[PDB]
């Protein structure tokens, strides 16, 4: 087997990347230490107005104001 | 005046035709492939207007290359006949200027001119390449002199 | 608007060129001048049940800004492969093949 | 003033254009050893003006086809179209702004292909339906390995906005990170102007194509729309993947240096026809189905996980 | 020699720069001295047409806070 | 003697697949003809710079005359029974000096093959072929030469036909 | 290397007869390659021969503005020339 | 001749010598007028040869 | 099928063809080519004409080859004469013989790319060919159908500097070849247009009178130069190209060995020319000398009879058949005893040739028949006679 790629990679060496590369994309993300950003990066987006929820006390996390240290902090997006 | 503007007029009509003549070969010929060498790299064509030449539909001068058989007469006039109107004839060989070494014989029109209009014609068994070139330029000088819209005018 | 203007202009200058075409010129038999390519019409569907994979293709620019980012990979991968082995039967089967 | 630039956008392309007629008959000459026009100008600077008023000049012979409404349709399609891709196109600043931009390039460049259909049927004869229903196989064919160089691509500028491609490019040429898409890309521009190593239609040698029938003014236009979209493609290439400068201040660099790149890949089109013996029409294909559409296909696969797994996924906008 | 293909090239080398310097200087003189603004997505509308309500009939015309 | 002209490690399997897939070998064409546009063109100015011909070369026909005045040809018929193309008509007299000399003479010269039978068979060197081939006609009479197209043809090239008989003599 | 071609390259604009000189040669004989005189000749044509070109452009005339009826300037001929110097242009003869 | 860089262009690209093989003749051509020449011509009968 | 007739005009070919197809969609079901259209009746005229005044029609059966065409003839009537050329006149029959085969071939390889679609090998090699035809204008007077292979000998001697002049010319002429060879032996884009396509099989060449490069391109070893020496090609050394796997590249990679075969035996033929006198010189067969028909009665009157009647050469017939470029070609003269002969056909390689084109060109597209009759290198001239 490993010495019918070396004339399928002689000649036909097209085909071989073709399924070589069509391949590779399929691996690259689920052994990647950073496919985990894509869904996060594109999560922090604000394209719409995040609306504000009624204050009744009972919720310590939300952060009050936009310059709380609570609430999503991205220091990761940067130097991501 | 009116008579100034399409004298100089008929001058840049004349001069748009004459300055790019695309030819198209009958090949038949032993005529042909001298008119080769006119279009290779000695004796360039292509810098005179003519080009590496194009086909029926697309050219303004039929070159008449080699004997005229009584079989290809027939072809000949279709081809002269499938041209644009502006269209002229140059007949290359004293094969098809008249016959040749091959002049009378069973099979073979005696001019290609018998078939259709000939304009200049250009003589020598193999024209040498510097002829036709000289009897292409001939037909420049007489695409030059022509004066259509003078005669539209003095009609 | 502007495109408007623009594609409109652009016509008027293809029809001038042949209007100056057919009249600045101003009989003698000048005017006169079949079988099915099968493999044509398979190319031609061919063409049709891809260029149709491109239009579900098309989307990705704006689907790779998905939040389920993991999910459009993996819908993605699966079109793209099934018409790949959709060709490849095409490959056997010699419709390819010219 | 937006009419100053369509005036200023139409006339330096069918002024340059003339001047590509000249340039493909010189620097081929020099290859074959042959000075080209010398004599009509300068250095042949006024030979195409010389053809431009005579082809006109020829009898438009509407030579018994079928329809002179397609006969004088196709034409006009033709130069209607490549003379509208330049509408779009993504200069420092371009004539309009379109989202879907590159897909409005696509769209037109392949509505092109009617021209060669109806071109080929009205005329009536074997050659003309012969060489149509062949050429457009091959756009046809080549569109599909187009649209995709043209999608993969986009997942990295993240948009269809050619005006975009010139940030994604603020500091690299994407030829860089594509260089098989750029490959395949040259050969679905080359070829796809029915243009080169793959002139199947209009075969010469072989066939007489479909603008056989055709002469003077109707001639004049396919040819006129066949060198405005030679300079396209390579105009594309010099957005798509050589990316030139751009800086808020000093707008022509980029215009600059776009000359540059798009006269090198319009003459770099020029080495090809003097160069390349004429792929077989089964080859062409061939090319296309069993060898650049799998790679295209994988490759496109590709680059949609390079997003996701580099978290790269570009900006919308 | 090879000299002769630039005449040529040089027309087809302005030919294609009148375009771009154009179309990027008719832009700047027929919208105030700055860019043509993009307008892309909705929200640059907006601010677009606000600007012209905010002054002149011209987005172009820009109030610098004295307004 | 004859020679045959048409007739795998990792190493030569990268190798075939380098040079068909980042094609390398079309590339050694493209340089191939980027070595001749720097080349310079063999054209010749053509109108100006004629190109290069020798004092073989055979065209236009001429009758030579003798320096004193005197036609040389003296109607042999020897150049019409062997001009191939059945060219030359040269019906003749006494021309009532007692002498010898043609009344007719004719080479149409649209059967005419240049192959200059008639300049070699000549005893006296009368009709030769000369080094015209710029005599392009708008019509068909203007190649039928009689004797007064063809005399005072050689009345006009024979300071340049001379040169080139007594350039070639010898060898003939 | 460049620096040269171009210096080398005026001088024949400027000393081909004067800028008139230049036009009516450039534009009417698309030439500027200097070259020496072999002779002046009756009708007003001009010889040059540069031996340092190859061997098609070391032998070219400059023809006359006009001669006799031929109003000659813009309809150059290939036969212009005369009999004298055909055996010389066509080089059948090194001989001037 | 040609501005080496020029030259070098045609070597380099060609891959071959150039300045040696010129499809141009330039001195390598034979001038004209070569000197006349002297062409070279018992028991001599016939119906021997 | 589809009865779409190839072009009589065709660009394709040498124009001269018509080529009737069947089209069963895109690929070819039949050829018949309808050749003809140049038949201009060269045999007949010949009967009319005495045996000089006949070697013209020789020079103009094949135009690309001129001189080797009269190398048959002049082979042939010195056959029927029993005398043969002189020594220098031998080698100037080889030197013009091979400077003929280069141009044939630069014809044949070049014409058959710009059918394909290759443009400048035609430009390079055709400047090459005017310098080639130079050396016919210098020798003969003609850049072609120069008449010079004379029945004798040639006509006239070699004038003082041609042998220099082909030196420098085969010299360099070398490098303009792989110049050649590198733009369209190695292309993936030639290979497909010209490898496996028109294979002729051995014993099928040979039956179909094939006689060529179509004959060795199969691996039949058989060149003519080497089987049945003609003139002094006994005396010079050359390698026959043959080749395997009889398709279009394996008969073009010939050519292009031949071409640089050619240039070895031209490299022998000036090393080693001798002084001599170049025609026999018995009068009665070979014109006398211009100096001695002016001073010597014996000359007039050999000179008047050879020129106004003939050479009557004895009454036989023999075919005499000879390497032209394109393949054997050879003249079955006929002779009477009269000055004029009485046949003369003239075998072209060509009518064997095209007639293969239907059997060559099966199972092949129409894109394919232009690469069958370029690998042909078919001349009109030779094949309508
Ligand atoms: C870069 C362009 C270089 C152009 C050039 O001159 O090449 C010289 C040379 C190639 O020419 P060559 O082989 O030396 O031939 C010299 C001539 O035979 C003999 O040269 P010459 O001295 O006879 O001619 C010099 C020339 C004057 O020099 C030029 O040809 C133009 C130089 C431009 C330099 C930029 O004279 C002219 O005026 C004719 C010019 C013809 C072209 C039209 C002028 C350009 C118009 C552009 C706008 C329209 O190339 C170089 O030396 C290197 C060039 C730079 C790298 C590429
Ligand atoms: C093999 O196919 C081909 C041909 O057909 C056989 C050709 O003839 C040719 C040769 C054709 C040419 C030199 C060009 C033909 C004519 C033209 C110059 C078309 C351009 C005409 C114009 C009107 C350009 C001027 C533009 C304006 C409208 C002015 C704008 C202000 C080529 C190159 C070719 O590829
Ligand atoms: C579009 C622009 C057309 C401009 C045409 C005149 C300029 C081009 C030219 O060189 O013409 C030379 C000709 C004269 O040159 P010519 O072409 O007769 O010959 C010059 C010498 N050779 C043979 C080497 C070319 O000038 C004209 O006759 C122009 C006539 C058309 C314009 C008339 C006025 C309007
Ligand atoms: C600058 C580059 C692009 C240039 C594009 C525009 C180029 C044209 C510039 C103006 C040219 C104006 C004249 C064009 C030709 C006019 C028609 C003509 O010459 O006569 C033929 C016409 C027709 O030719 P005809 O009547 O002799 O017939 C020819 C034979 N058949 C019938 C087969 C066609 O002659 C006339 O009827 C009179 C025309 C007078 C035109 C006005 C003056
Ligand atoms: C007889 C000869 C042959 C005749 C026919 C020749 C071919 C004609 C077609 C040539 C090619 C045209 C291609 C048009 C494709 C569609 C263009 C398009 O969809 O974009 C329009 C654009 C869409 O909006 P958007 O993308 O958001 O714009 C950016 C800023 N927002 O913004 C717009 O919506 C602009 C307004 C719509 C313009 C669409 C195109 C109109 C074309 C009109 C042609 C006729 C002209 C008038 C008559
Ligand atoms: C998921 C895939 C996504 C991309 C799909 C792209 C299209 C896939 C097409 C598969 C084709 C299979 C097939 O039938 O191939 C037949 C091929 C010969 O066919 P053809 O090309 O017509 O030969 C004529 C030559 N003149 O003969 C062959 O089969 C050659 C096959 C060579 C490659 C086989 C697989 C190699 C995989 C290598 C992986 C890496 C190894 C290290
Ligand atoms: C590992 C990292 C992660 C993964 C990275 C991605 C995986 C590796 C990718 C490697 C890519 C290698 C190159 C692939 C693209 C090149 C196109 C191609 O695949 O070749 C197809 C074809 C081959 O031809 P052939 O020999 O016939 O092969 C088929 C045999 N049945 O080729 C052809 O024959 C086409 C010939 C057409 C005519 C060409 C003429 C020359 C063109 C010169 C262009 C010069 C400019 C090019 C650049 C332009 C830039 C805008
Ligand atoms: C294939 O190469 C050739 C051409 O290019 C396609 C020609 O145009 C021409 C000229 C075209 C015609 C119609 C005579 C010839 C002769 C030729 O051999
Ligand atoms: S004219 Fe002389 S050369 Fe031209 S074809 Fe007839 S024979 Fe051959
Ligand atoms: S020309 Fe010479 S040959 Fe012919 S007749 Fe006069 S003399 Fe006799
Ligand atoms: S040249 Fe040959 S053909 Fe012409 S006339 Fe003299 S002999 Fe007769």
């Given at each position: 087997?490993?010495?019918?790629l ?7 060496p097209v ?11 399929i691996?690259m993300?689920?052994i990647?230490?950073?496919?985990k950003y894509?869904?996060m990066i ?16 009972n919720?310590?996390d939300?952060?009050?104001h936009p ?7 991205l ?6 | 005046?009116?008579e100034?503007?399409?004298?100089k ?14 030819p ?6 032993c005529?042909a492939?001298?008119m ?7 004796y360039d064509?292509?810098?005179?207007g003519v080009?590496?030449?194009?086909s029926?539909?697309?050219?303004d001068?039929m070159?008449?290359?080699?004997t005229?058989?009584?079989?290809m007469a027939?072809?000949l006039?279709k081809?002269?006949?499938?041209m644009?109107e502006?269209?002229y004839?140059?007949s290359?060989?004293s094969?098809?200027?008249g016959?040749?070494?091959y ?5 073979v029109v ?6 259709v ?11 040498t390449?510097?002829?036709?070139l000289?009897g292409?330029?001939?037909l ?10 003078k005669?539209w005018?003095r009609? | 608007?502007n495109?408007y203007?623009?594609?409109?202009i ?7 060129l042949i209007?100056?075409?057919?009249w ?10 079949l ?7 398979l190319?031609?569907?061919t063409?049709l ?20 980012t993991?999910?459009?990979?993996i ?6 492969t099934i018409?790949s082995?959709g ?7 010699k419709?390819?093949?010219? | 003033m ?5 005036l200023?956008?139409?006339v ?5 254009m003339?001047?590509?007629?000249l340039?493909?008959?010189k620097?081929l ?20 003006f ?13 030579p018994?086809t ?7 349709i196709?034409?006009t399609l033709?130069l209607?179209?490549?003379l509208?891709?330049?509408v ?10 379109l989202?879907?931009?590159i ?6 460049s392949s509505?092109s292909?009617?021209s ?18 062949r050429?457009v196989a ?6 599909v390995?187009?649209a995709?160089?043209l ?9 269809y ?8 490019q ?8 594509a260089?098989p ?14 243009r ?7 075969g ?5 194509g ?6 003077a003014g109707?001639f004049?236009?396919f040819?006129?729309?066949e ?15 050589l990316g ?5 201040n ?12 798009a006269?090198?890949?319009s003459?770099?089109?020029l080495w090809?026809?003097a ?5 077989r ?5 061939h090319?296309?189905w069993?060898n ?7 490759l496109?696969?590709?680059?949609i996980?390079?997003p ?5 996924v570009?900006?919308?906008? | 020699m090879w000299?002769?293909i630039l005449?040529?090239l ?11 310097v154009?179309?990027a200087?008719?832009h700047?003189?027929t919208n105030g001295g700055?860019?043509?603004r993009?307008?892309?997505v909705?929200?640059?509308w907006?601010?677009?047409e ?5 002054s ?6 820009v ?5 | 003697?004859?020679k045959?002209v048409?007739?795998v ?14 094609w390398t070998?079309?590339i050694?064409?493209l ?9 310079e ?6 109108p100006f ?7 073989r070369?055979?065209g236009?026909?001429?009758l030579?005359?003798?320096p004193?005045?005197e ?11 062997i001009?191939?193309?059945?060219a030359?008509?040269?019906?003749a ?5 007692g002498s ?11 059967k005419?093959?240049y ?9 006296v ?9 710029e005599?392009?006609?708008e019509?068909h009479?203007?190649?039928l030469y009689?004797?007064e ?9 024979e ?5 080139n008989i ?7 | ?11 024949q604009?400027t000393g081909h007869?004067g800028?008139?000189?230049l ?10 390659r200097?070259?020496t005189?072999?002779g002046?000749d009756?009708?007003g044509?001009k010889y040059?021969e540069?031996?340092?070109?190859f061997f ?9 503005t ?5 109003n000659t300037?813009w ?5 212009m ?7 010389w242009?066509?080089?059948?003869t090194?001989?001037? | 001749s ?6 070098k ?13 010129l499809?141009?003749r330039?001195?390598?051509?034979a001038?004209?007028?070569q000197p006349?020449?002297?062409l ?9 040869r | 099928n589809m ?11 040498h124009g ?6 069947e089209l069963?969609?895109?690929?070819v ?6 050749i003809?259209?140049?038949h201009?009746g060269?045999?007949?005229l010949?009967?009319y004409?005495?045996?000089l005044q006949?070697?013209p ?6 135009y ?15 056959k029927?004469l029993?005398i043969?050329?002189?020594?220098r006149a031998?080698?100037i029959?080889?030197?013009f013989?091979?400077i003929?085969?280069i141009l044939?071939?630069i014809m ?6 710009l059918?394909?679609g290759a ?8 400047e090459?060919?005017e310098?080639?035809?130079?050396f016919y204008?210098?020798?003969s007077?003609?850049?072609?159908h120069?008449?010079?292979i004379?029945?004798?000998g ?15 010319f ?8 792989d110049?050649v ?6 292309n993936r884009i030639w290979?497909n ?17 094939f ?7 199969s ?14 090609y006994?005396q010079?050394e050359?390698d ?15 050519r292009?060995e031949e ?6 035996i031209?490299?022998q ?5 001798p002084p ?5 010189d ?5 014109p006398?000398?211009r ?9 007039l009157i050999h ?28 003249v079955?003269?006929?002779?009477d005893?009269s000055?004029?002969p ?6 072209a ?12 060109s ?24």
């Amino acid at each position: 087997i490993s010495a019918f790629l070396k004339n399928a990679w002689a000649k036909e060496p097209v085909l071989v990347v073709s399924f070589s590369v069509w391949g590779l994309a399929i691996i690259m993300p689920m052994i990647s230490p950073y496919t985990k950003y894509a869904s996060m990066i594109n999560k922090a987006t604000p394209y719409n107005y995040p609306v504000p929820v009624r204050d009744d006390g009972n919720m310590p996390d939300v952060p009050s104001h936009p310059q709380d240290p609570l609430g999503p902090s991205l220091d990761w997006l940067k130097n991501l | 005046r009116a008579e100034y503007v399409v004298t100089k007029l008929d001058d840049l009509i004349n001069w748009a035709r004459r300055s790019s003549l695309w030819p198209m070969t009958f090949g038949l010929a032993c005529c042909a492939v001298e008119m080769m060498h006119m279009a290779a790299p000695r004796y360039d064509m292509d810098r005179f207007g003519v080009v590496f030449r194009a086909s029926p539909r697309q050219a303004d001068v039929m070159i008449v290359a080699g004997t005229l058989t009584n079989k290809m007469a027939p072809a000949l006039r279709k081809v002269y006949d499938q041209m644009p109107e502006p269209r002229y004839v140059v007949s290359m060989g004293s094969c098809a200027n008249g016959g040749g070494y091959y002049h009378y014989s069973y099979s073979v029109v005696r001019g290609c001119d018998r078939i259709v209009p000939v304009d200049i014609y250009v003589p020598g068994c193999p024209p040498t390449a510097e002829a036709l070139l000289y009897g292409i330029l001939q037909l420049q000088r007489k695409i030059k002199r022509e004066q259509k819209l003078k005669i539209w005018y003095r009609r | 608007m502007n495109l408007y203007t623009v594609i409109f202009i652009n016509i008027l200058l293809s029809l001038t060129l042949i209007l100056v075409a057919f009249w600045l010129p101003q009989y003698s038999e000048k005017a006169n001048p079949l079988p099915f390519s099968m493999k044509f019409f398979l190319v031609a569907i061919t063409f049709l049940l891809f260029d149709l994979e491109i239009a579900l293709l098309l989307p990705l620019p704006w689907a790779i800004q998905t939040i389920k980012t993991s999910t459009m990979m993996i819908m993605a991968f699966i079109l793209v492969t099934i018409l790949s082995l959709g060709l490849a039967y095409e490959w056997t089967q010699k419709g390819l093949e010219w | 003033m937006f009419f100053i630039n369509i005036l200023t956008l139409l006339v330096p392309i069918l002024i340059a254009m003339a001047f590509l007629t000249l340039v493909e008959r010189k620097i081929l000459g020099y290859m074959q050893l042959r000075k080209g026009p010398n004599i009509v100008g300068p250095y042949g600077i006024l030979q195409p003006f010389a053809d431009a008023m005579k082809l006109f000049m020829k009898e438009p012979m509407r030579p018994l086809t079928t329809s002179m409404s397609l006969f004088i349709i196709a034409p006009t399609l033709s130069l209607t179209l490549a003379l509208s891709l330049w509408v779009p196109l993504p200069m420092p600043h371009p004539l309009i702004n379109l989202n879907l931009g590159i897909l409005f390039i696509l769209a037109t460049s392949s509505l092109s292909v009617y021209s060669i259909l109806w071109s080929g049927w009205a005329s009536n004869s074997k050659y003309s339906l012969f060489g149509a229903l062949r050429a457009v196989a091959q756009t046809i064919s080549y569109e599909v390995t187009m649209a995709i160089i043209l999608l993969s691509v986009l997942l990295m500028n993240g948009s269809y906005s050619l005006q975009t491609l010139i940030t994604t490019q603020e500091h690299m040429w994407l030829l860089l990170p594509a260089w098989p898409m750029a490959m395949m890309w040259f050969i679905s521009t080359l070829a796809e102007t029915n243009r080169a190593p793959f002139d199947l239609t209009e075969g010469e040698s072989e066939l007489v194509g479909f603008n056989v029938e055709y002469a003077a003014g109707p001639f004049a236009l396919f040819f006129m729309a066949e060198y405005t979209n030679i300079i396209l493609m390579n105009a594309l290439t010099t957005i798509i993947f050589l990316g030139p400068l751009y800086y808020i201040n000093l707008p022509e660099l980029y215009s600059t240096n776009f000359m540059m790149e798009a006269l090198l890949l319009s003459s770099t089109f020029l080495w090809i026809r003097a160069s390349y013996p004429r792929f077989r029409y089964d080859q062409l294909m061939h090319l296309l189905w069993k060898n650049f559409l799998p790679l295209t296909l994988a490759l496109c696969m590709w680059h949609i996980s390079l997003p996701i797994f580099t978290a790269g996924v570009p900006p919308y906008m | 020699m090879w000299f002769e293909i630039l005449p040529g090239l040089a027309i087809m080398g302005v030919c294609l720069v009148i375009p771009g310097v154009s179309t990027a200087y008719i832009h700047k003189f027929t919208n105030g001295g700055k860019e043509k603004r993009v307008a892309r997505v909705q929200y640059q509308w907006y601010l677009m047409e606000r600007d012209r309500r905010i002054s002149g009939v011209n987005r172009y015309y820009v109030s610098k806070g004295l307004e | 003697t004859y020679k045959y002209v048409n007739k795998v490690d990792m190493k030569s399997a990268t190798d075939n697949a380098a040079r068909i897939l980042m094609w390398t070998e079309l590339i050694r064409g493209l340089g191939m003809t980027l070595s001749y546009l720097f080349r310079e063109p063999a054209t010749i100015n053509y109108p100006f710079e004629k190109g290069p011909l020798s004092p073989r070369f055979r065209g236009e026909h001429a009758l030579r005359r003798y320096p004193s005045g005197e036609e040389r040809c003296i109607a042999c018929k020897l150049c019409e029974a062997i001009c191939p193309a059945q060219a030359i008509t040269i019906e003749a007299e006494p021309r009532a000096d007692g002498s010898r000399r043609t009344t007719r003479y004719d080479i149409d010269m649209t059967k005419c093959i240049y192959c200059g039978f008639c300049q070699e068979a000549c005893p006296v060197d009368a009709i030769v072929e000369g080094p015209n081939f710029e005599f392009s006609t708008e019509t068909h009479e203007e190649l039928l030469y009689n004797k007064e197209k063809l005399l005072n043809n050689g009345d006009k090239w024979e300071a340049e036909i001379a040169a080139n008989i007594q350039a070639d003599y010898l060898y003939r | 290397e460049l620096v040269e071609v171009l210096k080398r390259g005026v001088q024949q604009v400027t000393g081909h007869g004067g800028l008139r000189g230049l036009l009516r040669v450039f534009f009417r004989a698309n030439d500027i390659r200097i070259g020496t005189l072999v002779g002046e000749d009756k009708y007003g044509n001009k010889y040059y021969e540069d031996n340092k070109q190859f061997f098609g452009r070391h032998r070219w005339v400059i023809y006359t503005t006009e001669m006799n009826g031929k109003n000659t300037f813009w309809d150059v001929d290939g036969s212009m020339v005369p009999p004298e110097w055909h055996r010389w242009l066509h080089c059948m003869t090194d001989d001037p | 001749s040609a501005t080496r860089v020029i030259q070098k262009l045609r070597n380099w690209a060609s891959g071959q010598d150039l300045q040696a093989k010129l499809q141009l003749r330039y001195q390598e051509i034979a001038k004209r007028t070569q000197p006349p020449p002297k062409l070279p011509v018992s028991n001599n009968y016939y119906c021997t040869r | 099928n589809m009865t779409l007739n190839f072009g009589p005009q065709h660009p394709a070919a040498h124009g001269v063809l018509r080529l009737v197809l069947e089209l069963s969609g895109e690929m070819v079901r039949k050829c018949d080519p309808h050749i003809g259209l140049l038949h201009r009746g060269t045999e007949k005229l010949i009967e009319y004409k005495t045996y000089l005044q006949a070697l013209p029609y020789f020079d103009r059966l094949d135009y690309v080859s001129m001189m080797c065409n009269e190398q048959a003839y002049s082979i042939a009537v010195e056959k029927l004469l029993n005398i043969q050329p002189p020594p220098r006149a031998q080698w100037i029959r080889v030197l013009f013989g091979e400077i003929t085969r280069i141009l044939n071939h630069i014809m044949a390889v070049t014409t058959h790319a710009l059918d394909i679609g290759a443009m400048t090998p035609f430009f390079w090699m055709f400047e090459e060919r005017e310098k080639m035809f130079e050396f016919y204008e210098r020798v003969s007077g003609a850049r072609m159908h120069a008449a010079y292979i004379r029945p004798g000998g040639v006509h006239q001697d070699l004038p003082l500097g041609l042998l220099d002049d082909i030196y420098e010319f085969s010299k360099n002429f070398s490098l303009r070849i792989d110049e050649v060879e590198e733009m369209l032996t190695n292309n993936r884009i030639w290979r497909n247009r010209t490898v496996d396509i028109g294979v002729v099989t051995a014993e099928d060449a040979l039956n179909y009178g094939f006689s060529g490069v179509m004959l060795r391109g199969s691996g039949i070893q058989w060149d003519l130069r080497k089987t049945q020496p003609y003139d002094v090609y006994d005396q010079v050394e050359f390698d026959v190209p043959i080749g395997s796997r009889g398709d279009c590249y394996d008969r073009y990679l010939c050519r292009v060995e031949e071409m640089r075969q050619s240039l070895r035996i031209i490299e022998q033929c000036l090393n080693k020319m001798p002084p001599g006198e170049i025609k026999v010189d018995d009068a009665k067969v070979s014109p006398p000398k211009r100096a001695e028909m002016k001073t010597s009665m014996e000359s007039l009157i050999h000179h008047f009879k050879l020129y106004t009647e003939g050479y009557q050469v004895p009454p036989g017939a023999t075919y005499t058949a000879i390497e032209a470029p394109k393949g054997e070609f050879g003249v079955y003269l006929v002779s009477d005893g009269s000055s004029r002969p009485y046949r003369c056909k003239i075998k072209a390689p060509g009518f064997a040739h095209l007639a293969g084109l239907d059997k060559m060109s099966k199972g092949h597209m129409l894109a394919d028949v232009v690469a069958i009759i370029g690998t042909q290198d078919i001349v009109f001239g030779e094949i309508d006679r």
